[PDB]
Write a protein that binds this ligand. Structure first.
Ligand SMILES: *[C]/[C]=[C]/N1=C2[C]=C([C])C([C])=[C]C2=N([C][C]([O])[C]([O])[C]([O])[C]OP([O])(=O)OP([O])(=O)O[C][C]2O[C](N3[C]=NC4=C3N=[C]N=C4[N])[C]([O])[C]2[O])C2=C1C(=O)[N]C(=O)[N]2
Lengths: 972, 978
């Protein structure tokens, strides 16, 4: 504290030596500076300009360029002041080139030597589009090998940068002259902590190949740190490679000070190095993915992994830099910051702790007043990317964002002309100041979606194998009907087996005959009057209890689905959380809708409008979302005051039994929920036709749904109501890939949309409609990514997709595949495992047109039709050419085309620039019309009303010429 | 006027001084009534409970009723205030004592005895007969004869009465000038169907009885005052007075009441004085402020009429002083009775009269017997000439009169309350109310530029212009008869050669025109036109679509009486029924326009950053609209305009017999400039094109209102998805009802009876909401049906263009034959109670018919007849009443008259109809106030006129956008952020 004030005074003074000894982006004479100036003045313009730079390299024709310019910036008149094609192209390309050292290896190597003669060391990084295949990972890997080979032939002629002593052939007498950095996920297109070991090994195998070449020339390899999703994978890759070459000192890892985890990660890493008696090198950065991590975490209800006050990152940096410097004997340090306070702190801290100069250096990005830094510090290394202008454009966008952020130390230092005292402030003080400077109903928290499984966590990774094993000790049970609170066995048993291993029998399911169905309907009807008269808030409370019951069994409930229906780990967990979401959301919806509301405002009169349940609801559930959709339909019916007779799909009957367990744990009154699995040919029509049924909730095939709708319309003798239908049926969903689509995003999202859970989703992409000029490029990357994926048992997280639901689904899907192969041409058909299991290959077929059967009929399996549209008008026309309208997707960065799709691509759920599956409660209420449904949307604010009928009570309040005056009366 | 105002104030000060601090009994804290009023004034919940209890009290005729109501209104013994079966006794006795305080007797001989006591104490009297509402000719006769009996008793007594002492004049007269016998009569008690809709009939019926009473009054040289009732009858009552006055221009002792709280009163008073001068007669005016203040304000607000009363209390006071001065200035033509308990008012009158030197025989003072006691005695001491208003008769109307007195005394603005409960400052109490007005006057939301929704003003037959408009517009319609009406498809007229005439149900020989029928070809053409028009209409901005409805609404509004007259002739709507039909259509247009504007903006859903979800609605396509004849403009416009504003295009089939009304949709939408093909008009034979229209693959939605049989058929057929059919067809359906009104033991029969009569027989009972079953509790059954049947007997059946008829012919020949057969069925099941005469000659007349002895197992307790046939069902207890109400397959509307909080609660919960009405008729639902529709066999749970309705015509869509590019996303206002 007393000492703290003294050192801070030394840091501040050093800060001014840098300011005394002291960019293009803030120079308002150049076109770039004027564009950034207006960007920092106008946020609307900033958004347009940055998005334009992002899409710019896809603007490959005069038409694409001209139209996008108009669409982002308006006409040549309403634009800002600062031939539109020529002025923008040359400038943007000029801005991009300022940050790269070359587009070829020979140019980069030539430029690197010029840098050396100016006294700058370098670390070289290879620019590239995201790796989406093995071939792309190999190209990336070979580029480093090629670079290293070039440098190998040159470095012998390089004099070492001048130092105070040591080896005049080494930089500053100690640093290796060749220094490269590699992006780990660029070495493996399927890097994913869900398959942690597989990812580590695949990345590590390529990294080792590069490292060996690096060691051959006694160079340095730094392993870059990417997004939080891959942080643990990356640390483990570094740890393994280090120990494989425990004696080689020139291996480095990046750590990010903006991570709450980093204090611990750095402590652990230092302890690990000590334990193994190795040395390490750390490049400490603040972090490149701030906005992305914040958004990502908030989208999945995860804890935000980054500090959210900017000074907290600065304070963390100075704190973690001190820790490394304290540990200089084992940990070499690279300070990687452009912040003069941060740099000045590191310099005085190294002085305070008497750290030798060969234990720390300073690094900055090429293109971002370097000389002034080099004069005070002396040991400066430029981060020097080289490669293609396409990824160079995306890199530029990053630099523009970085330099023009409100919290950017650079923007504050120039563009704002800030007080130097505030700039060189101890960020710990800033932190405390910033911290100092800083709705549900009925007493319940507001709704929030349940947190998604998070495989960055060791415990979540370990949980699945544990619970799959625990579920396996519980196999072989016989499951009874559940009627009026009693278990009811019958003599008709149907086995439920593992679709990935059909010899594994999970249990036996009793089947309800018509007598048993009639009993359950009778039970539901008898329970109805009391349940109807139960207060809506009380009914909602059972759903809340069921939700907690489920939340407590999350991994166990997931594991059942992995085995019974072949859900992948993530897919299984998402099914359970969606069930939880329905329970939480429908509970709140009933509370909201449960209070009678006064309508009209005439005095002497009270009108109250409110809702009543219908009676007995038949709920006929699908197997593809066996807990989520079952629970959603059933809980909606129940919470609105109806009583339910529930028929799970046969092959997911055990998941259906989970509803019994959950409502039982919640203490739901007897007969409000009854469980009657049964054979459709025996009791399907009976259930639908029955006169005591007032409502039918169905999700499944169009054919079955349409039949139900037809039969339910009949009013039989003794039937009290016209039957209400709540039906969600299938889709034939298209994703459109526009000319300007970002293919790094489009390809994996399309792959997931088509083959996630074997394509067994009503929302699945079964048609990808690709614009003529981007067709060949798109399919090549899509097929190459597909080839990298593996088909097999869903319990093994290394597999992308596995077996389809059952034998019948397999035969039907395979027939469709053959039909499609006669209509189009096969682009990819995966291997499948030998032996048992209902495996259908991951299948992609091109040459498909709207007249083809597989362009029209829902296959409900891993068969993707690729269709080539001649222009955007045809793409939309083709998207709209089926009898379905459930979901749709479009990858496009054209405001005009997006506007057209929003208007004309009329599906129930249209997605823009992301996959078209995985709808979430409240955020994406799900459902459509045409042959896809009856316009009901589960998980939305209109849904509960479908399960009820409105009532009005009107009271004349006037007696003997007087009436009470009510609040909202129109009076005098 | 400073000098006079100072004399008035000093006069008021002497008045208060001479009162000596005495409180009227109602403000006596030492008395039970005072304690009850004190607590009522401190606690509004109690006031409401206590006053409603006093209102229901005379119906609590058994010990169980009494005990239960006491518990339901006041809670258990330890829930009650201190000043409150033994409980049954102290309560009953105190309430009865309170009521007796305001009444001079129960029998004529008792009233007479007590009048003599009053004279001994120096008070004159005006006698008025207490009675329940007159609901029949028999009841009007009993009321009339009560006065005749009273007059005969007073004729024998008056000769022996010494005249009250005065300063001069005739020693045989009161104060030397006033006749000793003075009675007041309530005009509407003389005619149960008094209604300005039948203005001439109402005046004559009332005048004829008033004349009989008046001749007897004149026979003993007495005074008759005609009381003034609610605003609805004010013009009728004025006309009755004027005519009776002119019949006996030479008889001086005839008075009329005028009400200072009416904005009309300055003009009315002026007109009456001018009229009196013109005819060279004299008059007498009792000026009051007015008895019906809350009622008039509520009634006007409920009908979007201008409130006829001032709404700042001091305005009524200021009006009184102004109008009293005018009368006094005109003392030569106008005798004055100051009727007020307000000391400022009284003082004002006294000083103005002195300032104008008005002879004392030209003005007297009047107060209500049994209240404002010290004011009464103060008037006696200072003015000398004071007349007590003296009600007499049965305790049942005696209790309703008491409730009114309690209300009058305990009002926040009551002079009596402020003087005697609140200890208000004398200077404030006595200030010029004109000053009060200025000080109160100075001390005193829609969306998107549009004013909020309000229901169109109902036709108001208190106005001479509204009364005169109908015969005029009917005559004008008659010049338009004989046209041929074609189909209207894609903006063009299409003629077919199959023509069906449309005629006047009350005079079938009158042919209103000929209607072209669409075959399947033309219906297919209309569907093709709607479908071609759909894409551009769908893409039209919702606000722009709403604007077309707003223009149609204005077009309708400017043609209101015209459109109304067409309905009177084509389908036999009564004047009010016709107008209400057109206003309801206007309401739909205004309401659905606003609803589309509300629903037309996409809403962000969720709050995750980097993501925008917008939820919004899209139309379905071509809507078939199949409309009924019974609300030929209203329901048609409602269903069609809802489909239109939500972005669908409409193929519209009106009912045959109301096709011309259907053509009004063409006129209105074309006047609004609606794009071609958005609305198509295709009347046709159901047996030719009905199924075709419903079966058609390009239909996506069907809106139907009508019979259960047709509705269910449509539902079944529409469920099928045919080749080329784009959507699962959406059904919006309003079907029949078999609606019951329950009459509980404690029901107020004065309200229940006329409300049941209207619910059952308004528009000949041709409403889905109509009461067709009245379920009456055992103990009140005989009295209820006697009054109901007797009221029915007074009504006339005949042509709806004649406003004197209650109801007229039914829709057409088929309806007449169907209903008549049901009546015969019902007469074999139960027992006929009433079967009205009907006119001789042409017309589809069915007698107004009432049948008792009906049980749930009977056909006419189950099947919708849709005509003037009412089943009366006798329930043994309230549980059975509810059970019987719920014993049909329908659940559309229902009613209950009851004043039991427990029974009303049971009804709210278990009487599960779409629209349940408490203490009023179960018909005439208004847009927004009563969204209309039911489930069971009455419908599919859609409610026209309410905020869930438009959604049934659309399907929701969500657009989800990932807004993140290259690691950055715009931050939006409602994002969950940091
Ligand atoms: C059958 C009937 C009878 N009538 C009469 C008679 C006599 C002799 C007398 C005395 C009475 C009568 N009536 C009743 C009346 O009307 C009453 O009473 C009065 O009105 C009372 O008053 P006063 O007393 O002067 O007192 P106050 O407190 O002052 O006053 C009250 C009044 O006012 C008004 N309001 C209230 N509130 C308000 C008002 N206005 C405006 N605003 C507001 N907010 C009212 O009016 C009250 O009441 C009668 C008669 C006849 O015939 N008719 C009638 O109508 N009535």
């Amino acid at each position: 504290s007393m000492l703290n004030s003294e050192l801070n005074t030394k840091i501040v003074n050093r800060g001014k030596e840098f300011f005394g000894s002291i960019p293009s982006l803030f120079n308002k004479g150049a076109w770039m500076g004027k564009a950034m100036d207006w960007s920092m003045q106008n946020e609307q313009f900033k958004i347009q300009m940055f998005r334009f730079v992002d899409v710019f390299p896809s603007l490959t024709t005069s038409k694409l360029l001209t139209e996008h310019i108009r669409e982002y910036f308006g006409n040549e008149q309403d634009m800002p002041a600062f031939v539109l094609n020529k002025v923008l192209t040359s400038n943007i390309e000029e801005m991009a080139r300022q940050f790269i050292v070359g587009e070829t290896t020979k140019e980069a190597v030539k430029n690197l030597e010029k840098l050396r003669k100016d006294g700058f060391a370098a670390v070289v990084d290879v620019l590239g589009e995201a790796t989406l295949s093995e071939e792309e990972a190999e190209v990336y890997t070979n580029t480093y090998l090629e670079l290293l080979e070039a440098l190998k032939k040159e470095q012998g002629s390089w004099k070492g940068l001048p130092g105070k002593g040591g080896d005049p052939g080494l930089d500053w007498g100690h640093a290796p002259k060749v220094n490269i950095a590699v992006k780990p996920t660029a070495l493996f297109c399927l890097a994913n902590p869900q398959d942690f070991e597989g990812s580590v090994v695949a990345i590590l195998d390529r990294m080792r190949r590069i490292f060996k070449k690096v060691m051959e020339l006694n160079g340095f390899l730094c392993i870059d740190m990417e997004s939080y999703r891959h942080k643990e994978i990356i640390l483990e890759v570094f740890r393994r490679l280090k120990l494989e070459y425990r004696d080689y000192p020139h291996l480095g890892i990046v750590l990010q000070a903006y991570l709450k985890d980093n204090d611990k990660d750095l402590d652990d890493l230092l302890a690990w190095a000590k334990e193994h008696k190795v040395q390490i090198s750390v490049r400490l950065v603040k972090g490149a993915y701030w906005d992305y991590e914040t958004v990502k975490a908030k989208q999945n209800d995860w804890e935000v992994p980054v500090w959210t006050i900017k000074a907290e990152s600065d304070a963390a940096y100075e704190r973690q830099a001190r820790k490394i410097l304290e540990n200089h004997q084992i940990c070499h340090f690279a300070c990687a910051s452009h912040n003069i306070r941060t740099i000045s702190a590191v310099m005085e801290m190294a002085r305070e702790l008497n750290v030798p100069e060969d234990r720390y250096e300073f690094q900055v990005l090429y293109g971002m007043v370097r000389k002034g830094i080099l004069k005070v510090a002396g040991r400066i290394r430029l981060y020097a990317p080289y490669g293609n202008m396409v990824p160079g454009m995306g890199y530029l966008v990053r630099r523009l964002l970085e330099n023009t952020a409100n919290e950017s130390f650079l923007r504050q230092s120039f563009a704002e002309d800030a007080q130097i005292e505030r700039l060189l402030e101890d960020p710990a003080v800033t932190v405390e100041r910033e911290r100092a400077a800083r709705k549900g109903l009925g007493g319940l928290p507001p709704f929030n979606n349940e947190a998604m499984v998070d495989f960055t966590r060791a415990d979540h990774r370990a949980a699945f194998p544990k619970h799959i094993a625990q579920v396996r000790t519980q196999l072989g049970k016989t499951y009874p009907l559940f009627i009026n609170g009693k278990e009811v066995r019958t003599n008709d048993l149907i086995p439920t087996v593992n679709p990935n291993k059909p010899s594994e029998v999970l249990g036996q399911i009793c089947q309800a005959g018509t007598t048993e169905v009639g009993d359950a309907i009778a039970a539901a009807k008898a329970a109805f009057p009391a349940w109807r008269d139960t207060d809506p808030r009380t009914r909602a409370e059972y759903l809340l209890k069921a939700a907690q019951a489920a939340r407590k069994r999350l991994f166990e409930l997931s594991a059942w689905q992995v085995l019974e229906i072949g859900k992948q780990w993530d897919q299984a967990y998402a099914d359970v959380t969606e069930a939880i979401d329905f329970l939480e959301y429908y509970a709140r919806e009933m509370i909201r809708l449960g209070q009678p509301q006064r309508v009209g405002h005439a005095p002497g009169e009270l009108n109250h409008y409110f809702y009543e349940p219908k009676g007995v609801a038949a709920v006929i559930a699908p197997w593809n979302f066996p807990l989520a959709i079952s629970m959603g339909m059933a809980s909606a019916a129940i919470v609105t005051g109806n009583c339910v007779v529930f028929k799970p799909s046969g092959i997911t009957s055990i998941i259906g039994w989970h509803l019994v367990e959950l409502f039982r744990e919640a203490g739901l009154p007897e007969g409000v929920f009854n469980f009657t699995p049964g054979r459709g040919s025996v009791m399907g029509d009976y259930l639908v036709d029955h006169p005591d049924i007032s409502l039918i909730a169905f999700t499944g095939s169009m054919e079955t749904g349409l039949r139900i709708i037809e039969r339910a319309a009949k009013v039989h003798p003794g039937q009290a109501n016209v039957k209400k239908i709540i039906s969600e049926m299938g889709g034939k969903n298209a994703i459109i890939i526009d000319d300007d689509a970002d293919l790094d995003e489009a390809v994996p999202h399309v792959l997931y949309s088509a083959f996630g859970f074997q394509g067994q989703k009503c929302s699945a992409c079964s048609r990808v409609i690709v614009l003529d000029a981007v067709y060949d490029k798109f399919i090549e990357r899509l097929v190459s990514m597909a080839k990298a994926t593996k088909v097999g048992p869903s319990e093994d997280p290394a597999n992308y997709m596995g077996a389809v639901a059952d034998d019948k689904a397999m035969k039907s899907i395979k027939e469709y595949a053959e039909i499609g192969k006669r209509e189009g041409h096969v682009l990819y058909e995966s291997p499948v495992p030998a032996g048992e299991g209902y495996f259908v290959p991951m299948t992609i077929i091109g040459g498909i047109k709207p007249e083809h059967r597989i362009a029209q009929e829902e296959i409900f399996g891993p068969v993707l039709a690729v269709m080539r549209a001649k222009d955007f008008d045809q793409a939309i026309e083709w998207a709209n050419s089926t009898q379905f309208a459930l979901t749709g997707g479009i990858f496009s960065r054209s405001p005009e085309h997006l506007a057209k799709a929003r208007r004309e691509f009329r599906v129930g759920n249209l997605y823009i620039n992301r996959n078209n599956t995985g709808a979430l409660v409240e955020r994406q209420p799900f459902g459509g019309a045409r042959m896809s449904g009856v316009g009901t949307k589960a998980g939305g604010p209109d849904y509960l009303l479908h399960f009820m009928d409105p009532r009005v009570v009107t009271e004349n309040t006037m007696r003997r010429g007087f009436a009470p005056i009510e609040e909202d009366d129109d009076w005098v």
